[PDB]
Ligand binder design. Structure first.
Ligand SMILES: CCCCCCCCCCCCCCCCCC(=O)OC[C@H](COP(=O)([O-])OCC(O)COP(=O)([O-])OC[C@@H](COC(=O)CCCCCCCCCCCCCCCCC)OC(=O)CCCCCCCCCCCCCCCCC)OC(=O)CCCCCCCCCCCCCCCCC
Ligand SMILES: CCCCCCCCCCCCCCCCCC(=O)OC[C@H](COP(=O)([O-])OCC(O)COP(=O)([O-])OC[C@@H](COC(=O)CCCCCCCCCCCCCCCCC)OC(=O)CCCCCCCCCCCCCCCCC)OC(=O)CCCCCCCCCCCCCCCCC
Ligand SMILES: CCCCCCCCCCCCCCCCC[C@@H](O)O[C@H](CO[C@H](O)CCCCCCCCCCCCCCC)COP(=O)(O)OCC[N+](C)(C)C
Ligand SMILES: CCCCCCCCCCCCCCCCC[C@@H](O)O[C@H](CO[C@H](O)CCCCCCCCCCCCCCC)COP(=O)(O)OCC[N+](C)(C)C
Ligand SMILES: CCCCCCCC/C=C/CCCCCCCC(=O)OC[C@H](COP(=O)(O)OCCN)OC(=O)CCCCCCC/C=C/CCCCCCCC
Ligand SMILES: CCCCCCCC/C=C\CCCCCCCC(=O)OC[C@H](COP(=O)(O)OCCN)OC(=O)CCCCCCC/C=C\CCCCCCCC
Ligand SMILES: CCCCCCCC/C=C\CCCCCCCC(=O)O[C@H](COC(=O)CCCCCCC/C=C/CCCCCCCC)COP(=O)(O)OCCN
Lengths: 52, 459, 178, 175, 64, 606, 56
């Protein structure tokens, strides 16, 4: 139980919290949206050209 | 994964070359040591599974299951050595050998990289279990139970074999990583419908799904105590683990192929819980309870959400601990009075107080008292099901009530009232039995402090 | 509780039991002592009115319609003595009653305390062991060939005999065992 | 204190009034506060002073891990397993960071609702709007993926949404 | 022993397929399954075609 | 750091120390009950300080000290809400528990497991504190189920008695039905508001729909024993009297009401659930009051009084007066615990007799018990300038002057009269008249434990209403303008109840006898609700559970379809295949048939 | 003294020895999968002035 209680943070939750802190600071320091509804860059996507 | 596996194999000649009066001591010590070493698989990377080699890998889904297996072996040894005292040295070594081979097959099955190896080990677990049931089973009915356990399982698993070799012919691989990264949708055709059924029915019969569950009361009731312990704690979870792995190649068909299995599992949840209310046998009651719990797990896996997968993992682990504890508790009384009937011995709290405390705690975790991990799993599954459809709460709500009812019914019938006047051979509890109960219970309570460990990959 | 029951109740026993039940339910209705005493005397009189009836049929019909009246007019919540089968203390001390055979499983360190009690218990056990066979033989002697007919047991009849089947009647736990 | 960034976890200037006694009666709260101070807060402070004296003697640090930016799943060709692997690991790390962003915003919302007392419905509107924007974005990116989610399924969801939006804008331009 | 045997093991040897047994079995066995299938399928079809309409109030529903 | 948080947490922390010492040497001695009592009294005196801080500056706080687990976008933390409700309910509950533990040290003196009994009481107190201070729904559920299980264990204290086991399982069953709604609320709040904490739930629900509120209402109805799920509270009088005095009269029973008070910001935005809550409360108060006036067991009468007061708390929640409802919970604790302790002293003096028909003139034989029970009866009936008066008279005033269901208002008034009548019945029957108990008089109330505990709750029942009412900020816009008749409505109704009950009780001295009215039989047998609802559904469920699920499906048809059919078919085919007579003539003849078939239905096909 | 107690307790080395041998075989198995060591786009690094491999 002691060994399991002191297992190192390999699941990277502290890292993720610090990363989110950096991102939030930078994004509302610049007036940018906190999150974008697009996960991937729309300039790297090539949709089929015609839809009808 | 080799570090865990070789010592387990070593256990085999260590018990075959031990003195006649030291087999239990040696096996228990080194089983516990193996369990400690295994404890180190709980460190998980996060984004991906730990791939030790081409053949073996461990997951956050996998790590909890392996630790439970390795921990269950010494408990089975403690529970067995009482009723096996009259046995010859060679037959005791054979029994321990069966248990060790079962542990070895189980560890490999959970960590195999590809499906064909998983299938072979998942099927190899049948032989030691069958031998244990039919050779060391107390009753005449054990032979029938063995046949039911074998045939129900093979009738599901052979179509799975055909489906797997077909899938490797069409895809080129059965390695789970390649299977995941190169996943493509399953069209809606009769061929794909039957491929889905052949991929699902083996794990359904392992769970067991309601209506294909008749083998379980027979096999779990007619088995010796260690056989029952491993059948309820670990062997039921093969179906859940296999289903969680296999449902990655089945999308988007699961969206509507899951309807009949969801209906069966919810209504049969209600059905098996109600059955537990009118049961004259005490092992029969614990078996049907296991069925009811696994119905919940089937629902969670079929609806395919992150919360449902987390709840399913937690419920599998918690059920494995609680069900083993309940079987051991029933076996102590059976050892006293040599009958399984529940109303034979009554008012046992007056004669055995600490065992009554163990009974109360096991009954409280069976009805999922907060903040135990039984309730964590059940609550997560119930929330996911609510999102799936708000009407599931009625069935879920009803099940919670019936479970409390039969759990406390069992507790009240066996522990309360007045003692049967005629039975006068109820001796004090042995240190072995109390330690067995504590070694079941302490780990469950400890798990509440760190819930994420048993949560799974989705976490 | 202590007496062997009979195959049936006589008309007289039924009448006495109805008398007692009617009196108790009337006391439940008539809370105060004087008013209950008045109506209980009126009850006794109404009961004595048919005391010397010789026609069994009409006596039976009187008993039957009296039972119907009692059922319609009974108290829905009659007084019960606290340790009686409906009382609030009925089986309260059953959790404290431990059978005496448990004392043989005690650890020797537990019996080291209380040496005199356990010496006297060994005496009692010797007595039972040396009486058992005479008890069995006597019961076989005094019993008809077609098995016993009632639940009645005979007393001891010889010099140092004990009444057969006495151990679990004599060694009851207690009614306030702790 | 200065341990955490007050820009990510902000709070208002914390206006508190001055005591204005109106009676000759002694205030038992302030006397109890002096008693508590000199029985509890001073021994605890001394213990912490000693602990931090022992801490300063042996000072060591750890470093936040930094991860490069590798190509995402859009620029991986269909059966290239190594590009797919690295893209999927990157997408998973980004998913974790987005969960933590939503967590930070939810913490702000909760702290505001507690702090503003009876005036939370008007005084926490900006926190509520911020949460709404973040929640909408997070929902578009990851909702309905299901268990067994992946970067490819997130990309397919985005592409379906982009097609619908493009077609809607095109038929709005004909209006 | 007679009670427990009659309640468990003697039941199947004394079973006959009868109009009553068959009708009761069909009813209590498959009736509820189809009832619940109809209920859940109807509810989920309503909800899905409601989502297709852009009409469900799904704001804040990130966890599922 | 601010003291407020440290003291509020230490108050709950020190209560766990006698539980930690349960395995220690102290437990095996006769000093353990006094030790637990002293611990609880120290906890009470410590919780008095944060109450002073709040009453001075209105200080409130939430403490999220430990992070338990996080599921993607949801964070679960051990968090404590230390608002007005927590800091006001903690000292009241600790005070009542202190009095009842001092009482137990006398009442339960000859119990051989008094240490376990004290441990059990403490376990209940800890779980109730958890329930009350919880800031998210998971912690509140922990406290919920914890008090449920402690109730189960304490009702079935004398576990050799079958009726105790029945009553314990009944409490569990009714509670489970209520739990269903609790779990429904939890699931809705997580899939819609994405949180379980109170803060986020309040922000994201400005217009709360019906489903989560109806779940919360089902939970409250189960926990507070309202008309659908009421019968378990009177049957919980199977437990020892201290259990009844603390768990079933003044503390655990108010949890459902407290749950609805914790969520009042959401309920004030929904008039349907308010109507439902008000109607449920109105029927419950009237019905319980009606059942109480014909009961002969003293504990049953006080339990039905408790059910009636809980119904009143629910009606005042229904008229959108959450703060007023909370005040009654605090006020009612004092005098209802005192009433139970008085009944217990009577029962112990009269050789464990509980039927009032065998209690005679105790007004002189038990003077202090009589004084205390009279003062408690006057507080229960809303006598002016008493603890009962601030809480109940304001509630009747607010129910009179709001846009409310008319039937609910009428039922509330009739119940207010019923309260006076049952109180009158207990006093007239138990304390006035001539003795009706057996002749060996063992009456003796000269024990300092009993006197001190009852005197403590007596001072409470006299002054707490005034002090508490004057020491809290006003959360309610007071009703200043109402007609005089309306103002005197509670008083007029109470005096009517007094007079009519006393008249119908005085008429029992007369030497005249009549058979009971059908309304009497309805009142005494509890509306026949336990006679029917405890036999019909239970019979049908257990019968279908054996006949249909177990036998018809598992043992017969599921056997018939899959395994028995397989066995039968393979057995038939084996008999057909293997029963050959061994004559080569027959075998060879078949070979000819086979040869002809192959060269025609196989050889003509290429 | 130790002869016969070795002869009756030598079985207590089998499982620890198997554990050591399994650790060894796991290391040997790792030694077969070094095709991308210091070659991934995410972790590729410049070797220190004296180190030979980024992991063993
Ligand atoms: C909440 C209280 C906090 C207290 C702080 C200290 C607690 C330390 C306890 C550690 C764990 C207990 C071990 C369980 C096995 C019992 C061993 C035994 O045989 O006792 C012999 C020993 C010797 O007595 P004896 O005279 O020789 O005769 C004994 C007779 O056999 C018969 O004697 P008996 O009749 O007295 O029976 C023994 C006892 C023992 O039987 C039990 O059932 C105890 C276990 C409780 C129920 C277990 C399943 C329910 C699911 C909850 C999971 C929580 C686990 C959290 C992590 C724990 C880590 C281990 O039974 C009971 O007292 C009734 C149990 C009903 C409990 C209902 C509470 C529901 C949940 C409460 C809160 C849980 C979350 C905490 C935080 C919440 C948010 C702040 O007796 C005892 O010592 C009594 C045990 C103390 C009672 C503990 C009950 C509450 C503690 C729950 C877990 C602790 C949480 C700590 C976190 C901080 C808060
Ligand atoms: C202004 C209005 C003032 C009048 C209010 C009630 C006046 C007195 C009540 C009865 C007095 C009397 O003469 O006794 C005779 C007799 C007494 O029984 P007994 O045979 O002497 O008892 C045998 C032994 O003495 C048994 O002896 P024990 O030792 O068991 O003692 C019994 C015990 C208990 O006594 C009893 O056994 C009788 C219990 C039944 C009477 C309960 C009275 C309250 C009824 C509330 C009903 C609410 C609506 C319910 C609707 C149900 C519809 C099915 O005695 C007491 O300790 C005192 C009892 C309570 C007396 C004081 C009652 C005060 C509250 C009522 C007046 C409120 C005034 C303020 C109004 C504020 C708003 C303007 O009972 C009656 O004949 C009267 C029954 C009337 C029941 C009406 C229920 C209301 C709804 C009726 C149905 C409406 C719709 C039509 C049907 C549906 C068609 C579709
Ligand atoms: C009978 C007498 C009773 C009275 C006496 C009672 C005495 C007190 C009992 C109560 C003790 C309460 C302790 C509360 C927990 C405190 C410590 C807790 O927080 O540790 C948890 C951790 O608990 C462990 O994780 C438990 C792990 C599970 C133990 C398993 C045992 C080995 C396996 C056995 C077989 C298992 C089979 C099933 C496997 C699935 C969580 O730690 P965490 O908040 O993070 O720590 C933050 C700082 N860290 C991370 C640096 C430490
Ligand atoms: C006791 C416990 C046992 C275990 C439970 C096993 C459950 C297995 C049930 C399988 C679930 C559904 C199977 C297939 C899904 C739909 C079935 C069919 O009825 O749906 C319609 C199919 O239409 C008709 O119904 C054709 C099927 C009817 C013939 C099947 C006989 C069913 C009778 C029930 C026998 C019981 C089977 C289980 C034996 C124990 C849909 O219309 P359609 O869009 O056109 O077809 C879709 C397929 N396409 C796309 C390729 C065209
Ligand atoms: C909403 C989901 C659930 C709704 C309820 C569905 C039906 C529930 C049926 C329960 C079946 C359980 C069967 C096995 C129970 C065990 C046997 C048993 O308990 O025996 C009965 C036992 C003994 O009887 P006593 O009178 O107490 O004995 C005293 C003298 N000896 O008493 C009981 O516990 C029976 C309890 C059954 C309750 C059923 C009635 C409840 C109906 C509730 C409907 C109203 C809901 C409330 C609405 C509130 C407003 C929103
Ligand atoms: C004891 C005597 C010795 C006293 C010296 C200790 C003085 C204080 C030292 C504090 C411990 C060091 C510390 O602060 O480390 C923090 C460390 C981890 O950080 P957290 O944010 O709290 O959670 C982990 C996830 N982020 O927390 C600790 O271990 C110490 C505080 C733990 C409090 C005790 C646990 C109480 C709750 C028990 C679990 C109950 C069941 C779960 C209920 C769920 C309810 C939603
Ligand atoms: C203990 C009781 C368990 C019983 C389990 C029984 C059900 C198992 C699931 C179905 C079993 C057979 C499935 C076949 C294996 C999958 C192989 C596959 O997917 O190939 C299909 C072939 O699909 C089939 O041929 C399957 C047809 C069925 C043949 C055997 C019928 C057996 C009974 C079927 C219904 C029972 C299944 C559900 C019963 C569950 C148990 C009650 C498509 O390949 P192609 O031929 O190339 O077609 C496209 C190119 N033209």
């Amino acid at each position: 139980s002691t060994f399991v209680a002191y297992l190192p943070d390999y699941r990277m939750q502290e890292w993720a919290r610090r990363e989110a802190e950096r991102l939030v600071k930078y994004r509302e320091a610049n007036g940018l949206p906190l999150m974008e509804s697009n996960c991937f860059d729309p300039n790297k996507i090539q949709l089929p050209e015609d839809e009808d | 994964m080799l570090k865990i596996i070789i010592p387990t194999t070593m256990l085999l000649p260590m018990t075959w070359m031990s003195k006649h009066n030291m087999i239990w001591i040696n096996a228990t010590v080194h089983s516990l040591l193996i369990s400690l070493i295994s404890l180190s698989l709980l460190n998980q990377l996060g984004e991906n599974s730990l791939n030790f080699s081409l053949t073996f890998f461990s997951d956050s889904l996998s790590a909890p299951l392996l630790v439970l297996t390795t921990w269950l072996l010494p408990l089975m040894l403690m529970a067995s050595q009482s009723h096996l005292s009259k046995e010859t040295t060679t037959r005791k070594k054979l029994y321990i050998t069966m248990l060790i081979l079962l542990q070895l097959f189980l560890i490999m099955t959970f960590t195999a990289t590809e499906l064909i190896l998983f299938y072979i080990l998942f099927e190899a677990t049948l032989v030691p279990t069958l031998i244990i049931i039919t050779r060391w089973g107390n009753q005449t009915e054990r032979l029938n139970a063995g046949l039911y356990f074998l045939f129900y399982t093979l009738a599901g698993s052979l179509p799975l074999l055909v489906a797997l070799v077909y899938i490797q012919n069409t895809t080129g691989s059965l390695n789970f990583l390649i299977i995941h990264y190169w996943s493509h949708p399953l069209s809606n055709s009769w061929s794909n419908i039957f491929m889905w059924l052949a991929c699902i029915m083996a794990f359904m019969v392992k769970m067991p799904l309601y209506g294909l569950h008749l083998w379980l009361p027979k096999a779990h009731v007619e088995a010796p105590i260690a056989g029952s312990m491993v059948l309820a704690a670990v062997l039921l979870k093969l179906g859940g683990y296999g289903m969680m792995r296999i449902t990655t190649i089945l999308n988007p068909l699961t969206n509507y192929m899951a309807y009949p299995f969801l209906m069966l599992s919810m209504w049969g949840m209600i059905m098996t819980s109600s059955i537990c209310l009118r049961q004259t046998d005490l092992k029969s009651l614990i078996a049907y309870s296991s069925v009811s719990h696994m119905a919940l797990v089937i629902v969670a896996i079929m609806i395919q959400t992150p919360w449902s997968f987390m709840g399913a993992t937690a419920l599998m682990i918690a059920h494995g601990l609680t069900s083993s504890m309940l079987f051991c508790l029933a076996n102590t009384n059976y050892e006293r009075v040599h009958s399984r009937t529940m109303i034979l011995a009554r008012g046992l709290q007056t004669l055995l107080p600490l065992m009554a405390t163990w009974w109360l705690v096991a009954s409280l975790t069976n009805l999922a008292l907060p903040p135990s991990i039984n309730l964590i799993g059940e609550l997560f599954i119930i929330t996911a099901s609510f999102s799936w459809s708000n009407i599931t709460i009625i069935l879920m709500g009803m099940n919670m009530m019936i479970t409390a009812l039969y759990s406390l019914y069992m507790l009240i019938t066996t522990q309360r009232g007045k003692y049967t006047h005629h039975i006068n051979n109820i001796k004090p509890s042995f240190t072995r039995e109390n330690a067995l109960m504590a070694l079941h219970i302490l780990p469950l309570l400890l798990l509440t402090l760190n819930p994420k460990m048993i949560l799974g990959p989705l976490y | 509780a202590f007496s062997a029951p009979a195959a049936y109740l006589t008309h007289q026993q039924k009448v006495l039991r109805l008398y007692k039940r009617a009196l108790r339910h009337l006391e439940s209705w008539c809370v105060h002592r004087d008013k209950y005493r008045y109506f209980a005397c009126l009850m006794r009189a109404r009961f004595d009115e048919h005391k010397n009836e010789k026609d069994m049929v009409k006596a039976t019909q009187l008993l039957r319609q009296a039972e119907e009246e009692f059922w319609y007019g009974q108290h829905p919540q009659p007084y019960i003595f606290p340790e009686s089968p409906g009382g609030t203390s009925y089986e309260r001390y059953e959790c404290y009653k431990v059978p005496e055979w448990c004392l043989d499983d005690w650890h020797p360190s537990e019996k080291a305390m209380y040496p005199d009690y356990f010496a006297k218990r060994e005496q009692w056990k010797r007595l039972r062991r040396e009486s058992w066979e005479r008890e069995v033989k006597q019961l076989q002697e005094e019993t008809p060939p077609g098995g016993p007919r009632t639940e009645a047991l005979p007393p001891a009849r010889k010099e140092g005999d004990l009444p057969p089947l006495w151990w679990h009647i004599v060694t009851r736990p207690r009614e306030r065992p702790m | 204190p200065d341990s955490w960034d007050k820009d990510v976890y902000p709070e208002p200037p914390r206006r508190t009034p001055a005591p204005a006694p109106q009676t000759s009666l002694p205030n038992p709260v302030t006397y109890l506060t002096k008693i508590f101070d000199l029985l509890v807060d001073r021994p605890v402070t001394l213990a912490r002073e000693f602990i931090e004296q022992q801490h300063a003697k042996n000072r060591y640090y750890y470093y936040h891990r930094e991860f490069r930016r590798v190509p995402d799943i859009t620029e991986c060709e269909e059966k290239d397993i190594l590009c797919m692997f690295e893209a999927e690991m990157q997408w998973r790390r980004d998913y974790k960071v987005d969960q933590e962003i939503v967590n930070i915003i939810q913490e702000r919302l909760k702290a505001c609702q507690q702090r503003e007392g009876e005036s939370y419905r008007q005084n926490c509107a900006k926190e509520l709007e911020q949460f709404t924007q973040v929640s909408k974005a997070f929902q578009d990116r990851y909702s309905d993926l299901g268990a067994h989610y992946s970067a490819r399924k997130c990309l397919a969801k985005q592409k379906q949404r982009m097609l619908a939006e493009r077609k809607a804008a095109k038929e709005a331009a004909a209006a | 022993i007679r009670w427990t045997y009659a309640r468990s093991a003697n039941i199947y040897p004394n079973f006959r397929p009868t109009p009553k047994t068959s009708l009761l079995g069909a009813l209590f066995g498959i009736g509820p399954l189809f009832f619940w299938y109809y209920v859940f399928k109807t509810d989920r079809d309503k909800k899905e075609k409601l989502i297709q309409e852009g009409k469900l109030d799904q704001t804040f529903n990130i966890s599922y | 750091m601010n003291p407020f948080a440290s003291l509020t947490l230490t108050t709950l922390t020190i209560l766990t120390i006698p539980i930690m010492m349960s395995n220690s040497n102290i437990y095996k001695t006769n000093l353990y009950p006094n030790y637990v009592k002293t611990t609880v009294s120290y906890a009470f005196t410590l919780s008095l300080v944060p109450l002073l801080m709040f009453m001075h500056t209105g200080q409130e706080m939430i403490i999220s000290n430990w992070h338990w687990m996080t599921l993607q976008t949801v964070e679960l933390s051990l968090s404590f809400k230390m608002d007005y409700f927590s800091v006001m309910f903690i000292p009241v509950a600790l005070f009542v528990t202190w009095s009842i533990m001092e009482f137990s040290m006398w009442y339960m003196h000859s119990d051989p497991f008094i240490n376990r009994f004290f441990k059990y009481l403490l376990l209940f107190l800890i779980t109730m504190m958890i329930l009350v201070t919880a800031n998210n729904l998971f912690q509140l559920f922990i406290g919920w189920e914890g008090v449920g299980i402690m109730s189960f264990l304490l009702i079935g204290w004398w576990h050799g008695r079958t009726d105790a086991n029945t009553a314990a399982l009944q409490a569990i069953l009714y509670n489970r039905i209520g739990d269903i709604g609790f779990v429904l609320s939890m699931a809705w709040f997580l899939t819609h508001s994405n949180a379980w904490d109170l803060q986020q739930i309040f922000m994201l629900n400005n217009e709360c729909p019906n489903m989560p509120l109806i779940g919360l209402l089902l939970a409250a109805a189960g926990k507070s024993a309202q008309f659908g799920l009421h019968p378990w509270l009177p049957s919980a009088m199977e437990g020892p009297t201290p259990v009844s005095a603390l768990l079933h009269s003044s503390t655990m029973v108010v949890a459902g009401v407290f749950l609805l008070i914790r969520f009042y910001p959401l309920m004030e935005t929904n008039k349907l659930v308010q109507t439902m809550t008000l109607c449920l409360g109105a029927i419950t108060t009237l019905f319980t009051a009606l059942c109480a006036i014909t009961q002969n067991d003293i504990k049953k009468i006080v339990a039905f009084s408790t059910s009636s007061q809980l119904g009143l708390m629910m009606v005042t929640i229904g008229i959108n007066q959450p703060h007023l409802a909370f005040l009654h919970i605090c006020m009612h604790a004092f005098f209802k615990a005192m009433l139970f302790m008085c009944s217990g002293s009577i029962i112990h003096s009269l050789n464990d007799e509980q039927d009032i028909r065998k209690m005679g003139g105790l007004y002189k034989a038990m003077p202090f018990t009589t004084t205390a029970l009279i003062i408690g009866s006057l507080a229960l009936t809303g006598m002016p300038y008493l603890t009962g008066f601030y809480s109940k008279d304001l509630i009747i005033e607010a129910v009179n002057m709001s846009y409310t269901n008319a039937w609910a208002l009428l039922m509330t008034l009739i119940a207010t009269s019923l309260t006076a009548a049952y109180s009158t019945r207990i006093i007239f029957f138990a304390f006035l008249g001539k003795p009706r108990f057996p002749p060996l008089v063992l009456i003796n109330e000269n024990n300092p434990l009993l006197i001190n505990s009852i005197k403590r709750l007596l001072i409470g029942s006299i002054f707490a209403g005034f002090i508490i009412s004057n020491n809290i900020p006003p959360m309610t816009v007071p009703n200043t303008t109402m007609p005089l008749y309306m103002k005197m409505t509670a008083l007029i109704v109470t005096i009517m109840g007094f007079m009519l009950a006393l008249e119908l009780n005085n008429t029992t001295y007369y030497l005249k006898f009549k058979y009971p009215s059908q309304t009497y039989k309805f009142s005494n047998m509890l509306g026949y609700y336990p006679s029917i609802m405890h036999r019909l559904p239970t019979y049908h469920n257990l019968s279908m559970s054996q006949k249909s699920a177990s036998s018809l499906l598992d043992l017969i048809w599921l056997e018939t379809i899959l395994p028995k059919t397989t066995s039968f078919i393979q057995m038939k085919m084996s008999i057909m295949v293997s029963n050959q007579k061994g004559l080569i003539k027959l075998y060879f003849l078949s070979f000819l048939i086979t040869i002809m078939i192959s060269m025609t239905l196989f050889n003509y096909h290429e | 003294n130790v002869l016969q107690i070795v002869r009756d307790h030598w079985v207590h080395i089998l499982v620890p020895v198997g554990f050591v041998f399994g650790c060894y075989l796991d290391r040997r198995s790792d030694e077969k999968l070094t095709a991308f060591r210091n070659k991934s786009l995410l972790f590729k690094r410049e070797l220190r002035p004296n180190e030979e491999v980024t992991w063993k």
